[PDB]
Design a protein around this nucleic acid. Sequence first.
DNA 1: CAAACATGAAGGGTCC
DNA 2: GGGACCCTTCATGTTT
Length: 85
Amino acid sequence: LGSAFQKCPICEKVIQGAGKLPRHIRTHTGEKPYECNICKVRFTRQDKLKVHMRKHTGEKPYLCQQCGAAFAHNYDLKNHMRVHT
DNA sequence: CAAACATGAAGGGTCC
DNA sequence: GGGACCCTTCATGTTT
Ligand SMILES: [Zn+2]
Ligand SMILES: [Zn+2]
Ligand SMILES: [Zn+2]
């Protein structure tokens, strides 16, 4: 009822955080909308994709600031950036 | 064959 | 709303 909490429409559990209901709903539906650009593994949250990318940034340190895609060469990252703008 | 242990994935808290 | 990191539980694998 408070602005800090939401009720899940599927399971009626209370969830904390104004924007944090969608990440809970995806745990029901299985939606994994974040994909590692290197190994294509998918994740339910940007949260855990960012941590997963640590596996790759040792060899691919050039990171997109919009989506976190990792690249071995800066000219690869620059070509990626065309996709955003 | 079970119990302990390591590791990490999953999910929800919590604070900018 | 988003990013970021924390905290706890639990699943899986490995060691003892
Ligand atoms: Zn729910
Ligand atoms: Zn990956
Ligand atoms: Zn990008």
